[PDB]
Symmetry: D2
Subunit: 506 residues, 4 copies
């Protein structure tokens, strides 16, 4: 296998191929005559990356790195993941999606069209990898903040899958980004000459649903019923409907619904680690009961149940207010330490400023947001580093645990225990600064722990299909955690005793 | 052949693959669900290309296009070749070479090192294409204007090979860019951490020469003695020595020596088309007799001989002046229409300003340069569009004629008749504006003509090895001219009479 | 994929490729210009096959067919399987094994040597198929009747795997024949110059065992813990030891031990279908208690337990006699219908002649053998077609059920219910002739039923790992039954509405 | 490249792969654990080969060897070529052709049908090798002795190509056997259910001719005008017509016409080496002037011309008698040493018995035949080993010289000088026994010499296209002579100085 190795991003090491490797692979001459470690390659990529004057340019550099040398791509990511997550995934990935006609380099992923109904198995055969354990599929209809972007949203399952690997350690060769193109209702794309999608309105109803049914059937026929299928930015009602439809038939989840709710409940439990009270000692007023607070309320009721409180009064503790009409305030549209959750994305759609809370409540108010908020310079001297609830706290570790143990379905208990682990992740010195989530530089480790917990759950509820149940699940998950470290392409040469390998010259 | 087709730049058409082609190639799903002609792809590439604020960025866009979709790359080039020649080749390619550590995307070409002495055949085996008809090899030692750039000069044989295809129509799959890395004497690269080459001094003498001997031997052993081997920016003395060594042993030429001289003689003959006199009615004073004016003087003497004038007095007509000591003045360091040739590159190293000549000589002076010179606004009203002598007038057409007819060696007569054809290319209305060279937008056609002439010569002097000699050489060369038009990847399905293709069910 | 298709036996159809298929596969011209159905190909193969004057020649023809066109090979087999089972498998395969140095055509299978200890994963990587669901491994040490044949015994896992497909419908591409060469103690092979194996004595003890441990580990690391690993002709004590070692750690079984016992118990239960009594109404005297009657006695005790009779007296019903010291007599070394089982292979090592029993017992004696016995011409007029207990009644259907449902381990209950199904297979008109086993021409169907039963068991005892449990297991097993029918290699071409597939010419 | 190497007959060495080679090729485990030299493999093949009781069985063994391991196949052939020539080629190949429906193993060659008119380039693309330097094409219409065998005659270009390699040393990978199926007029094949060809009458006239024109055009378009195209057993008139048509347009010859004539003239000149006279001292009576003696007479006239005798009287020396009406008697239907040539094939169609000549002429008669004739036991004591004129004396060496030097056309002078070299090959002690041709065990050497002579001719008449003309043509031809010796598949690993190959860990 010669020149084709330098064209495979999973194999190509660039100038990190040693001379022995280049000679054994038949690629000597195709690479410049220098031999680099991955550290030097990282430094060179970083120099080229810091010369860009845009997040779009940085994104293009990272995507070219991904399609050249993906071990180096994930070395770039897993080195300062907090820096590259905004560029590879939201927010920058949404803007790149907005500008994919202009900035269309090599295409990545699988584009499955409504007009391919009946032939999705062949389209799956078109993907080069055959051992696919995770599929992130998007509709393109509700790209975060940007609305309908159909067939430009392909950067979302790609970017998100990068976070599967960067934050979780999921093997990138076992990941399949899919965009289901059923048309778009975005009028600017129907007229855009650079638009790469179907230029008609979105198909919906008994053709959309049958396309999705055939997609799930084809994916689990080719890759097995254990294939994790995550649904990306679908429309809200459509997303919830598909979640309820496929949740128990397949190994699917929706990170926008279940991951967001899990992060919110994680923040609430981390705040309880400060209020020193039980979840039963809390009454919750929600502010955005528009399918977003529904997941938070359900998972919070489930946590109240698990700590002992039966369903009815656990539901009595929730006061969901939206446009018609205490201890914890959560918005997605009296007490010593009130819990205020902004949880709204664009930093302008929000409930507070992380300084409004901390300067109005006299600083004795535990704030959390889904929007980036700089530290506080409160007059008394309290600093109050405010924590941000990233969805990357949930889906990488959950996906790693589900892929590791072949978990067949992802019930809500998985997400509750994920929230519990994320709550336990926060250090008391971080809680001293009002920080409700672990730092992103720890996400790998955090993911690992979550995976183990998820594994520990799935075996004790007969959900894990991997056999036999590993006695030590930490080392089993660690054996599946993908690392950006290069493999050795040198050939394992050994010999036999010099009487078995004797060439007979009879 | 599925996903690998989208990774082969010679095959990949991107969204220009039709649905039938995508289904037949097993690549359906890998491409966005839109179907474009090459015109729409060109418009999209041009939109992305005009958004760049640098020639380096434009160069990077074009090189990414080349390694994605090379039919589209050559469609971009052959559309307004005058615009993209400065970016793909000199001057911009030299600056990119200066910045190849920073801007190192996918590597192209073959890097053959002095330490590979004895194993060059294996390195040639490393190149994916087996039918190589043109090899542009560089040392990296005398990159135009930039000096020693060793192992950064790989962009020079790549860029130049692009001009082989864009300007000449040479098949890009039959072209092999080679950089011979023997070390570098550039001290800034020996310390540069981004440097991709050997970090020692240049090897020279009986090891350099044996490396070059083995390189020529290996190239003609793998690709045949008819393989055209062009020597790129070697050191001046080294370049001339290698030219004289390999000129009659192989199908080699040096475009810096022979191409430059041919362009200069072409300009001189085009100027004679204005002075209305014979070449014998001219006495030539040279100004830069430093191996650069030597080729011009030799080829000019050869032209004087061919028009009738024997060698001795033809040499008597040349007055080469440099630092120790009429009708035509040529510099590379009385009469009605004096011929002034600047021929110096950086527009600052030169002999005139194309306005100094035209305002001092009262406009009755035929000027030519190797430097870009804007038009003149002379007070009387004479405009005087000054022509520029590009090396792309010579090497593409000569290479096309040599590859077409399997010409075994390229004598100086080839370059003289190339200069004669280029002189004949200029229109009388262009000569009315003082323009000595055809416009670059015509280069393809010009190359074709040159090829035919070269072919016509090689057959009548028993130099063309292609058999049988085509009766109509224009259509034979046209059958080999590569075009950026996409091929059809659909399968030629036919049937037999429905008694021969009957399936026997005995 | 052109010429390589005609070299792949799983793909190559020979002259059964249609013209459309030949043109689409790029193989047109490589095949003679005739188009045959598989029926005509079968007739041609049969004509060539009936021209041979030896079972060795017939075997060579069938093995060449297997390595040319394996769909046609299995069409030949599954057509009159009773005729080709003696040639593909025992007895003829043993004689071919004896003569593999002389008759060494293309090698099939994987040869793993004791000197490969530590590198078995790479050797498994050497096998072209990656989806292996059944591995038949042999030591070569106890080839049936022939003794130690080490590294000539490779025809045994090959032949047996053929029966996996011919009799069971197991996919042949998911089958891997392995020979573990640890040397041989056969002195004639150590001196044989045609011998293809290690020419030293058998390795044994802590190196043999570690080689087997690494083999099981490597096979289940590459192909999954669900890979069925059948142990072939190992030495008796070695075979039983390995069975007990790996029985619960892996999905392994030994067909010589468990399959033989299952066939014997099947014959006993079929005979009970004639004696009209319960198994509790029988006392069993065995004659060959040398690890061969042990399995029969254990499985018979298990059947007595399952019908109601507790362990102690169920064991009291067994009288195993060998060299020191009624209703049923079984040998592997009073009542209305005595049951006499010869069960000994070479027709000379046996307990009766199938005529001795029927002429001495006055015909009222139910005889079964493991040796071929022609019908009886008893003086009264009773014909008494005597049945033969083939191991192919057990292992194909059990393997099909285990591969279908991903059964993790094969307990003895699987083999008991297999024996019960085989007993139920016999028709009452066949029991009227004293025939205790179904005819081999039914084996496919029989295998299917066994598979379903095995499946039905594994799900109700939480042994089947395939998910979800199919509601209709017959159609699920039928979907996995491999058939010799050719697939269509024509490409599924469809179109989009002629507005989505419109090529944009903007 | 793993398992595919064992499936490529040009690469596969079987058990001759060393352990290092098996590990480097990723084929370890696919081969039995023994390591053989080609001598041991030859001995094993010979043991299996001498166990056959038919020339048809021996032929099948050799063809299976050819499609398994072609270096070993040509080692078998080039070892005792006199023994295996009758089996690989005529006479046995004709009988195998008669029995190709019964004995149809793996197909070899390219079947191009009349119904493929217009698509022969695609069919040539179907052949796996791209560097084809020799094409033996047959019609199947005049298979030697057997008549029309259409599409069974494919064994003739295969067998003959084997002799290209075995006797000449032509590279087998550069050889392409083609059968042009235009139907058959053999009535037994039109009804034969095993027949693999077109079951209609032969196409002829303006469709046959256009198919042949497109075949020659396609072969020289894909493989170059230097591709040697030999026409095999075409019909006599058709063969001569095609020879005259394509002789000067392509590098074609007909071995049945020109090779036979060259062998006959070689025998005549060798006999002159006994009669001690000049060719001008001979008058020739022919007996079979039916297009077979025409070539002999033309080449003999050419030899008379070359020795000095002008055309007219040189033709006066020929007396061609057939059914209407001295020194040399030649049949294809006074003096001290009369020359009697039987030259008729089936030993029953002939002019003498090689004993009739030697017992009637009193032993002083130089006999030659085309039929095998055992030695003579003449009463006086003279032994008279009679020589046989094989066509393998001509076509292998001529083909080697034509492929070596890229000779563009094969004029009759090539065949005359071939006859002269073959005449010179005979030793005087062999001439003492009345043997007119060199022994076949020398054919390789003989071929070499012929090649050199042919090369020496083609350069001095400007027929050789290979450049540059090698100063020593013996060593140039020897560098192209293919040998059955195995290549080494081990990888050439070298290192750089341990400062150039230092991995930078900046």
């Amino acid at each position: 296998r010669g020149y084709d190795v330098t064209r495979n991003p999973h194999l190509n090491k660039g100038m990190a191929f040693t001379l022995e490797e280049r000679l054994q692979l038949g690629i000597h001459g195709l690479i410049p005559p220098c031999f680099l470690s991955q550290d030097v390659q990282l430094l060179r990529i970083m120099r080229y990356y810091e010369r860009q004057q845009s997040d779009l340019d940085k994104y293009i550099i990272l995507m070219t790195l991904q399609d050249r040398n993906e071990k180096l791509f994930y070395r770039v990511l897993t080195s300062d993941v907090e820096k590259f997550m905004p560029i590879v995934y939201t927010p920058t990935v949404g803007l790149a999606c907005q500008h994919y006609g202009l900035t269309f380099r090599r295409p990545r992923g699988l584009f499955i069209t409504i007009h391919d109904k009946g032939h999705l198995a062949t389209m799956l055969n078109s993907w080069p990898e055959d051992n696919i354990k995770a599929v992130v599929v998007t509709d393109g209809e509700r790209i975060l903040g940007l609305g309908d972007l159909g067939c430009y949203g392909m950067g979302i399952p790609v970017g998100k899958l990068a976070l599967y690997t960067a934050c979780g350690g999921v093997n990138p060769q076992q990941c399949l980004p899919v965009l289901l193109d059923v048309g778009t209702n975005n009028e600017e794309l129907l007229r855009d000459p650079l638009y790469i999608g179907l230029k008609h309105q979105r198909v919906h109803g008994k053709a959309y649903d049958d396309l999705l049914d055939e997609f799930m059937q084809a994916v689990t026929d080719k890759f097995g019923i254990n294939c994790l299928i995550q649904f990306e930015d679908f429309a809200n009602a459509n997303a919830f409907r598909l979640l309820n439809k496929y949740r128990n038939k397949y190994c699917m989840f929706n990170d926008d619904i279940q991951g967001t709710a899990s992060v919110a409940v994680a923040g609430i439990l981390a705040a309880l680690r400060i209020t020193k009270n039980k979840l039963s000692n809390h009454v919750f007023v929600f502010q955005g009961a528009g399918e977003a607070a529904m997941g938070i309320a359900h998972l919070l009721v489930m946590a109240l149940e698990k700590e002992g409180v039966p369903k009815a009064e656990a539901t009595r503790k929730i006061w969901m207010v939206d446009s018609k009409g205490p201890t914890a305030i959560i918005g997605v549209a009296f007490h010593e330490r009130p819990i205020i959750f902004a949880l709204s994305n664009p930093t302008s759609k929000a409930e507070c400023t992380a300084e409004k809370c901390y300067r109005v409540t006299e600083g004795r108010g535990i704030f959390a947001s889904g929007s980036p908020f700089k530290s506080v310079t409160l007059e008394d001297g309290k600093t109050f580093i405010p924590g941000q609830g990233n969805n990357a706290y949930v889906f990488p570790g959950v996906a790693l645990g589900v892929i590791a143990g072949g978990i067949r379905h992802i019930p809500d208990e998985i997400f509750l225990l994920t929230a519990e682990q994320i709550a336990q992740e926060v250090s008391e010195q971080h809680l001293s600064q009002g920080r409700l989530y672990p730092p992103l530089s720890t996400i790998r480790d955090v993911s690992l722990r979550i995976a183990i917990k998820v594994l520990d759950y799935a075996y004790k509820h007969n959900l894990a299909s991997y056999y036999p149940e590993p006695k030590d699940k930490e080392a089993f998950v660690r054996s599946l955690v993908y690392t950006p470290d290069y493999d050795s392409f040198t050939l394992d040469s050994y010999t036999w005793p010099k009487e078995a390998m004797n060439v007979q010259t009879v």
